[PDB]
Design a protein around this nucleic acid. Structure first.
Ligand SMILES: [Ca+2]
Ligand SMILES: [Ca+2]
Ligand SMILES: [Ca+2]
Ligand SMILES: [Ca+2]
Lengths: 338, 338
DNA sequence: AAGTCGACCGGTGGACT
DNA sequence: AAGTCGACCGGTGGAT
């Protein structure tokens, strides 16, 4: 559970344990001895808890503590079973903690979207936990989908075919000149729900926890929307970075720039909103770095001039992340006709 | 020395050793037991050796083994003095190996600059080791300085005050709109030598090795040129990354775009040349990534659009690194009037 | 399927203050 | 100084 429990831990099938012993089944080219079972850790720690939508204690708890809990539980489990034999590289904890930060945060936003969408289709404003009711006029056309995007994703694949074609022919021409304009992906995209889906309950249901079925539901969602999103319907891009270093700031800054060049410059979309979330900015310089103007618009006679990255957000609690996303939708979705 | 020597290691004062035992003098908040003394490692391994300018075997050796030598030498010393107690985090090796790659490569380029400059002032082409003789007409005005740039550096500070003022005025306008366009730094910049310095011999002197005094000379050089470089005289920027990961590509790509926007767009400089060096690209993805057209080149839509990053270079040997740099200077310096 | 590729970030040694 | 600030990259768990 969220709070570690030996009983709960003993009740776990060997393959459900947070630590997997691979001392006898090594990974080729790797001297790894114990693996952090990331999916098992999410199921154990957050199987019945989505922070911000759980007990008032968890919702208002320091988000750093919430995010660090799965690894802590895992290390507690490994220590119990293997004592002094238990060993995991720093880089194992780094990789997993990053994924925990992203996945959990995306789940928080997923439930935000569910509650938002329910309101949009004319139901009430669910009251527990308590968040401020949006002032925006409800409409099914103002629903959104929260899409955790996979490694190796190209965000262009979200767009309707005709918009993809504009981009493809733009690049094709660049190539015959020895140039390219590859696109990677933000960690997450919030998109206006396609009309086709605007009465599917899927997008209006809050999940109770990151059980395996729910992990899969959230991580697979983007597939349902590929080739269905209009350029202006990419409402928000988010890059999660649990901590920052000066050299690890530039991927979201660059991708934001490319998204803006393509969507605003080539496809006539409004300002593309792209933000970065972190738990540990390690100084004030990352904030300055993210004050940078989007480059394309700096050329005369191009698109609107604005920041590439709208904000570097440091969520103090899960409840604050939820509050901020609701407030964002309240503003951004006003641009969408009811 | 380059080849480990038990004797030479004995001759070392303990403060000169490559492995510092801090088991009883811990770093505050750290459980580090042994430290990788990086500057000591450079003096021990390269004190009398600049690869590409040393013995034939070292010049032609796999550059990976050359750059990997200081850490290998360090581990040997550690295992000697401390046996099974000797241990270092992979993150210590990562940090040190990265610095070695950059510093050694920069030293190679420094000696290249020295030889080029000697040629430019009419002293002929130093023949040992033997590299192809540049064909470009010699001129004191075509001398260059290789500047290993420091942490927290802003490349704009290299520029003559008049050019710095142009950039500040541009940013002033941006700050009025809540925007900005900060500049960081490449690892290294090659700049045309200011006329004021074109008969100073330090710039034509090849160093014998990375003794501590020579480390300081190379690492301090940029201070001598600050506020003296013309915008069009920033001739090459280099970013060193010993290995690549997909998320670690974007700082040079982004910074190159900004350099192009400011130097080419605001200051009328010729094409800004910015390259990335690595020993381990880990696939072909990075090469594709670095084929990207300049964002502000696309923004301007002039007759010629060029890449932000000119090349991703994987040096096979220190001699190739030297050869490539000489050939680059032979072409680029043609843009400077004799 | 399971394997080959994606992308995750934290502990480090040195310069500056 | 010892404390604070930059920027280095390598080992990881899993997804058509
Ligand atoms: Ca993801
Ligand atoms: Ca991320
Ligand atoms: Ca540097
Ligand atoms: Ca570098």
């Amino acid at each position: 559970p969220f709070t570690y429990s030996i009983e709960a831990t003993r009740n776990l099938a060997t393959t459900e344990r947070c630590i997997q012993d691979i001392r006898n089944a090594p990974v080729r080219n790797r001297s790894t001895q114990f693996q952090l079972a990331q999916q098992n850790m999410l199921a154990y720690t957050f199987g019945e808890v989505i922070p911000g939508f759980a007990s008032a204690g968890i919702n208002g708890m320091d988000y750093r503590d919430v995010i660090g809990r799965p690894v802590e539980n895992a290390v507690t489990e490994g220590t119990h079973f293997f004592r002094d034999d238990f060993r995991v590289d720093s880089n194992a904890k780094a990789k997993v903690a990053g994924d925990i930060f992203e996945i959990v945060s995306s789940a928080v936003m997923w439930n935000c979207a569910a509650r938002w969408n329910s309101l949009m289709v004319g139901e009430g404003w669910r009251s527990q936990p308590r968040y401020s009711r949006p002032t925006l006029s409800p409409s099914p056309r103002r629903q959104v989908a929260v899409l955790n995007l996979p490694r190796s994703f190209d965000w262009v694949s979200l767009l309707v075919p005709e918009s993809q074609e504009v981009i493809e022919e733009f690049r094709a021409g660049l190539r015959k000149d020895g140039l390219g304009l590859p696109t990677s992906t933000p960690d997450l995209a919030v998109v206006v729900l396609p009309e086709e889906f605007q009465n599917d309950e899927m997008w209006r249901e809050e999940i109770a926890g990151l059980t395996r079925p729910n992990q899969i539901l959230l991580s697979g969602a983007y597939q349902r929307l590929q080739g269905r999103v209009q350029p202006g319907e990419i409402s928000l891009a988010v890059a999660f970075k649990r901590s920052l270093r000066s050299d690890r700031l530039y991927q979201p800054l660059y991708e934001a720039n490319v998204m803006q060049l393509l969507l605003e410059g080539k496809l006539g979309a409004p300002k593309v909103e792209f933000e970065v979330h972190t738990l540990a900015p390690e100084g004030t310089n990352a904030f300055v770095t993210y004050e940078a103007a989007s480059l394309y618009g700096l050329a005369e006679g191009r698109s609107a001039v604005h920041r590439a990255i709208r904000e570097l957000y440091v969520p103090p609690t899960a409840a604050d992340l939820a509050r901020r996303f609701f407030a964002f939708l309240n503003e951004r979705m006003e641009l969408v006709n009811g």
